[PDB]
């Protein structure tokens, strides 16, 4: 079977301009495990992105955490781009400080 990914984009710590933080993209509930996840800065892909080791939940669906160090500003925009066999086109989720 196939299962589409759930997506959450958020920071590790309360966001505050000028202060170093970590930008996360947590993808879960998907199957198969092959998936493409990119963190974006003003539309452009960030290179120094890492991710957790593949694991899965009780129902066998997979989960992964993608993350990168970053320093938020009032202007710069951040988002997570996800592509999976279940998606007709890449899904973009913008980072919202309040979520």
């Amino acid at each position: 079977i196939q299962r589409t990914p759930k997506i959450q984009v958020y920071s590790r710590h309360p966001a505050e301009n000028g202060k170093s933080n970590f930008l996360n993209c947590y993808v879960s509930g998907f199957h198969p495990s092959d998936i493409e996840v990119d963190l974006l800065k003003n539309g452009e892909r960030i290179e120094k992105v890492e991710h957790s080791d593949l694991s899965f939940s009780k129902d066998w669906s997979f989960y992964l955490l993608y993350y990168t160090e970053f320093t938020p500003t009032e202007k710069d925009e951040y988002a997570c781009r996800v592509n999976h066999v279940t998606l007709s086109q890449p899904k973009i989720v913008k980072w919202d400080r309040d979520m």
Binding site: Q8, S28, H31, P32, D53
Partner: protein, 275 residues
């Protein structure tokens, strides 16, 4: 005060060229402590938590030997299942396995597990009595017949009730500073006006461990689920977890609403109310 040790294995066939991608991870409660990735350069089981680094060379050589034997079994499994299901050799498929044990509050064996999945669906699982198997379909039934004749359950039971629990207890002691410590959620509430007459109250629970938690909203002392939203618990990335629940309320009526937080790290559940 119960605890668990669990191993998760995932193998994905790659028909275009080469062997399956194999990834194994080990966890104690919600803490990952080891991993193996067939795509990594070391080709060795590797540490993912400080407290496991205490183990000596014989430990790592042994776990590496065993995890590589695990990957070869899965490789063979992918071939076997492809036949059982009469599937093409051109498609990629996935086998997953998870096993482990739980110790109760008494620190004694509580239960063992050993289950398998093919393409994201239950395939075969060891029942709680650790003596019989649950086979989901006829492919799994053939596996079940083979494992009964070979007495695989007996072998697993011996591991799950003995070795598994013994090592779980050893790890719990070695990494007690973190593994036997609970981190209570750090909580607060935020306010967001959505219109001239409505506002959103969001109740936050941050940096907690373990992951299990419950956030509930009440209005005038009674549970409210309408007009609410709760996100799935997520990893902060530093080993702790986060979650939030929000509710839309009439501006000016914020005081009637309370957020309730239950967590193992809290002697008594917490109650939050907007300023």
């Amino acid at each position: 005060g119960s605890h668990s040790m669990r191993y998760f294995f995932t193998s994905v066939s790659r028909p275009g060229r080469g062997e399956p991608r194999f990834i194994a991870v080990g966890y104690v409660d919600d803490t990952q402590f080891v991993r193996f990735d067939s795509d990594a350069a070391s080709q060795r089981m590797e540490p993912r938590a400080p407290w496991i680094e205490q183990e000596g060379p014989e430990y790592w050589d042994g776990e590496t030997r065993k995890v590589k034997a695990h990957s070869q079994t899965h490789r063979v499994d992918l071939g076997t299942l492809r036949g059982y299901y009469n599937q093409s050799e051109a498609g990629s498929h996935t086998v997953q396995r998870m096993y482990g044990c739980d110790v109760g509050s008494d620190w004694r064996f509580l239960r063992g597990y050993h289950q398998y999945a093919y393409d994201g669906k239950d395939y075969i699982a060891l029942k709680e009595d650790l003596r019989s198997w649950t086979a989901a379909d006829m492919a799994a039934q053939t596996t079940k017949h083979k494992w009964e004749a070979a007495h695989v359950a007996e072998q697993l039971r011996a591991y799950l009730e003995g070795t598994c629990v013994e090592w779980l207890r050893r790890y719990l002691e070695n990494g007690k500073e973190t593994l036997q410590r609970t981190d209570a959620p750090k909580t607060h509430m935020t306010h967001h006006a959505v219109s001239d007459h409505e506002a959103t109250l969001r109740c936050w629970a941050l940096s907690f461990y373990p992951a299990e938690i419950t956030l509930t909203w009440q209005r005038d002392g009674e549970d409210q689920t309408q007009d609410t939203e709760l996100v799935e618990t997520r990893p902060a990335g530093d080993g702790t977890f986060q979650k939030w629940a929000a509710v839309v309320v009439p501006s000016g009526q914020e005081q009637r609403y309370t957020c309730h937080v239950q967590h193992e790290g809290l002697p008594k559940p917490l109650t939050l109310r907007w300023e």
